Amino acid sequence: FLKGLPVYNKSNFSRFHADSVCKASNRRPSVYLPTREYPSEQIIVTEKTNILLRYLHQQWDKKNAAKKRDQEQ
Amino acid sequence: RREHVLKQLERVKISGQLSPRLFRKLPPRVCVSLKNIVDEDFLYAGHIFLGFSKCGRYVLSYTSSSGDDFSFYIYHLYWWEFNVHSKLKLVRQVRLFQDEEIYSDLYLTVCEWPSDASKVIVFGFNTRSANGMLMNMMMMSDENHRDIYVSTVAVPPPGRCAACQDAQCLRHGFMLHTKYQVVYPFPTFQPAFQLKKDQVVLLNTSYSLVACAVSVHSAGDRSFCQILYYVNYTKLYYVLEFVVTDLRGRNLRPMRERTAVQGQYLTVEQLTLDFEYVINEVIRHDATWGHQFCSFSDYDIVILEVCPETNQVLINIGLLLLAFPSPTEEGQLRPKTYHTSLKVAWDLNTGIFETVSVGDLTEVKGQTSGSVWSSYRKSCVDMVMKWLVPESSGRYVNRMTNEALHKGSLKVLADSERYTWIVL
Amino acid sequence: GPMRLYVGSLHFNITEDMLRGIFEPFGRIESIQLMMDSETGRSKGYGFITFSDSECAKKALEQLNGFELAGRPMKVGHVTE
Amino acid sequence: SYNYVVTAQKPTAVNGCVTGHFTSAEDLNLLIAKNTRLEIYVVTAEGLRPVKEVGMYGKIAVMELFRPKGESKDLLFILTAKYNACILEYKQSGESIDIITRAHGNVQDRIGRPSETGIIGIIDPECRMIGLRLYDGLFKVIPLDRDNKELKAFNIRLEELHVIDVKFLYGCQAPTICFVYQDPQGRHVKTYEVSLREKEFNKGPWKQENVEAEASMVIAVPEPFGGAIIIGQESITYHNGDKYLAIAPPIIKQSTIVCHNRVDPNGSRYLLGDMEGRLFMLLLEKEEQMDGTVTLKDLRVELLGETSIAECLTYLDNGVVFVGSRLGDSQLVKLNVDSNEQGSYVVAMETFTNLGPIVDMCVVDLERQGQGQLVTCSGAFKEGSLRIIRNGIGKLHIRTVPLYESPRKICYQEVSQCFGVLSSRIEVQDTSGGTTALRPSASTQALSSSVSSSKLFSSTSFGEEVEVHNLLIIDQHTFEVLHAHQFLQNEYALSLVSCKLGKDPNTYFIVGTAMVYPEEAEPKQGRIVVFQYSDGKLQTVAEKEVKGAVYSMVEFNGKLLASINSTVRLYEWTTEKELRTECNHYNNIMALYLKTKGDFILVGDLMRSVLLLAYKPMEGNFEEIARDFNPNWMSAVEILDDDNFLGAENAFNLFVCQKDSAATTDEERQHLQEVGLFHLGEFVNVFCHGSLVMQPTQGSVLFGTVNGMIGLVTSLSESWYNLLLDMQNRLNKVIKSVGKIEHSFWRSFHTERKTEPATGFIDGDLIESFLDISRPKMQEVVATADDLIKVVEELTRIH
Ligand SMILES: Cc1ccc(NS(=O)(=O)c2ccc(CN)cc2)c2[nH]cc(C#N)c12
């Protein structure tokens, strides 16, 4: 059949109950007020070189290596 | 199939996504006849309307009065007030290229910088330069030269500010003007690249590329030098009281002062890059065929990209040269004429230029020399179109042109942000 | 002037300034007319170029008719008016 | 002018929902993105256990969980609407809960225009890179490696300038993207191999394939099957090289599939969400190989039942799915093996309140006197309702009145003790040549009904959706639809007002309509109809034909002020009980919003900012006083006082422009200078002069947003502003931000044209956070008044 759905745990949703019908504006999660400072490992940065300027630069570096490998045939 | 306007409006309420890019397929909201908004009609001069400004508040126009007596033209620029269905109200009148003798009718273009709305630039060029003779009918033209007229004018203020009128006239009512001659192959006009960096203009004068920056500063001393944070560089200051530029407010030249001035001062910067020096350096240091090189006959420079963040200018150097063929001997090794291209990145901050790519030598087996530049320019158009990335609206270079007096068709003046047309 | 050419099958992003740049090396150009579409505000892909000398126009025609410009073969021909 | 913006109700619409193992390696978490709110839950026996709610300084545009090599548990990636990218980690030390910012930084580019389908963020299955589709013709690549101090991101040019959707494919040697793009030839599907070494695209494993013209979504099928699934309007396809399977079920042709969710970890079953709320099940028939690999045999879709109009679907555990709705209430549903009497396999377990979208509202003293109550028009389509919000002592109390159709406008008529509600229901044409209703709604279930018998406009397509507009007369106590007046065929009711006109002692219900024919797109004609609900029945008093759409309509000194397309017109109520034009104003583009105070009129234009008109009683005409010259695409306007005006634009910002006091010449008298700038992060549809508290500093303006957020705008004194500004700047030096996003940067006025710092506004949410922090870490006081409870606690009394 279409059913036989995954089970990460049989206990999940086995004791769930809410004595209400179509009413739940409870924003139960307590808000997080961070006051402690913990440094970051990395810093996300963008490559400033233009995409065309980058392509023309590496293509010229590959064209030089094709001619600069003539010490040996 | 086009969706109804009310259906689109309904969707905005429930989605919260409203943008001009979303409403692009939508027809214009309002289109007013030019005749209905213009005043003191009759035959009211020869006003050639250019178009809306990027802000959509100003509508520009110009006039080209000949004076049929000889004849030397006078070009005047105007700024009008758009108030939808109401009449246009003139806000600024300016004379362009003061004390300049214009023999032939100029093809002029008014431009705006991507984010600097405080000033506008006006390019102007003729088909050919005026000669030094006369052949009854007219003065005649020089087939080897062309005149280029560049001028920067300040935009009227949004309102208020420093109203220190010593009786009319104010703080930002400056004008700058220059003129240079060009040779064959006449440099290409690239306004989208030439003005990609705010307050700057890249000018091709055949012999070199000039980066000109014009800026005004007040009491504080935080921002200094746009260009150049060796090759030639000049920086001059002007207060009210190498391409030759003569400044003015609305009259004559303001007093050229120095750094010790207090109040308001204008700065003119010019960084030049000598083409022949660049060509010789690239061939000498980076060319693989440098040993075969003898001399170059002609060159043509085209801009490929301008990076306003890193202050880098990517140029392509089409070069006609004379060189010896490959060391292989099949007989007489007499030199031949070759065409090639050199790509160089020009750093505006440091002033140093770097070699990006060096082309191979293609033999010119008797080409018309005109076809060489026509083919080279097609490859530049091919390259730019190939690597074309759409930019943000409000970051574009607004180019305004109305070729009405030059055997040319303009019917609509559109403000594609407010969906407004001015039907001519 | 002596000759008026028809330039067609152009990419919509190709400008009049680009058209000038490609044709000007063949000779003196009297005028250029790249047709714009009023509604869109973009090009129609066709135009007219008038040379000051007939000879230059023919040479431009031979080297530009049927050759690719931005991947689309360009159409260059004679038009009286 | 100085103002104080505070939240009464936080946004409740669900924008994104994702599952993983974020708080612990064994915990099964559900993370909900509610605009700027990040709700973290743990799936237990009692259901969803609340953890914490992370308040981000930015709109959550991308939310994905990923686990790189040698990581204890899943890491979270957040990308804001202002391009603030960050990698977060959850850490709990017994009782102390803390979110660590592993990496952070802005990824915006000065070039590139934002894409039509918005920000798309995808992570490689082997956690080798992060792929971002921000702008047209570009694809940003963020490599993942904790070895380097920085994360050098770069752009790779994308030949396809109009990308619909993109995903990373599973079971590949090199990271491979699979996307659907549009061009003049139609829509196609393409793949590229991303090379981190060369920083470029390489030839995709499988190439060119002509897909449906309305192909909107891409599904990356996990490791066993491989390839991708493409969902369109008419068909669902499977692609994996020469392997191709396509199905055209007629059931999915009636409504657009807008969301999906993987049920099985191997990708055998997928849940599909519909615009109509129908829940589907996409089955992928397995075909095991003797090689050890697996293939696909068939594709089949099965209708499960009906749910809320879902934005995101998320399978939790043991046949229970979370339905994340933005146009209505969110649900917890159960997928059962046995279908009920209706033939539905899905049953609802719990329903979560969603007030958004708030399209219109009003403040009324319903029960008791002097205590205000908001009466909003919430939701859309079958999710449409009316919400009654009030500050109840013994915080907020909501009462839902389901309509089963989109409400549009609302007004109160106290003399009649009822509400006037404009509603719109969708009808489908059949083989009878007439339309039928999809479901019984409020307009079809009324006690008494009527149809418009007008002949002003004396002189369709099968299977096309048409809107049927009605005026609902709803009781104030029972909220039962007392009367439903059906307008003309192809007539849309846009504006609504309840007032007395001229010397007439009768209170009327005035409706502004517009004719929407399937032939023409432009609204060329409409009407202004005057109704009176005397005693249990509605009667048509008068009608005035107009040459356009009646957008806004407000009462003006016993007169009827209306906006018709680009015209702002004033009407007089004659002795014969007819409307007569007095004066007109034509200098507008799309006059959608009108607000009046005395003889002044604040005109809000959809594209041409705001404008101030003044009615001259002696002359009997309007006068253009001042204009806001800055280009703004308006959403809602409000009059603060005689000199200051409040506005809300399309870039989720608020602004306040005023009359220049230092102006000397008449041209300077016409310039409205913007003195207040603030980034709200919401899209305001309506402003209201009111307060939910029984009746420090003047001003009280309520506003409803698309996300269901309800806020307040109160005017502050220059002394109070300078105090609160210094306290706000001192609070940011003690209160930290998740993702290291500067508060000054977040609240900054940002548009695609300009960016300027926040001014003339105070973030009330940040000020009131002073009460929640610990006593020792409250040293924002450097002169004494250590006990700053007299302030803030008095500021919280405005709610
Ligand atoms: C190669 C080239 C490049 C650019 C030119 N102009 S631009 O105004 O800078 C420009 C226009 C349109 C786009 C993209 N839509 C990009 C730049 C040019 N003008 C004559 C040229 C030649 N030859 C030429």
UniProtKB/TrEMBL annotation, chain C:
<protein>
    <submittedName>
        <fullName>Uncharacterized protein DKFZp781I1140</fullName>
    </submittedName>
</protein>
<feature type="domain" description="RRM">
    <location>
        <begin position="3"/>
        <end position="81"/>
    </location>
</feature>
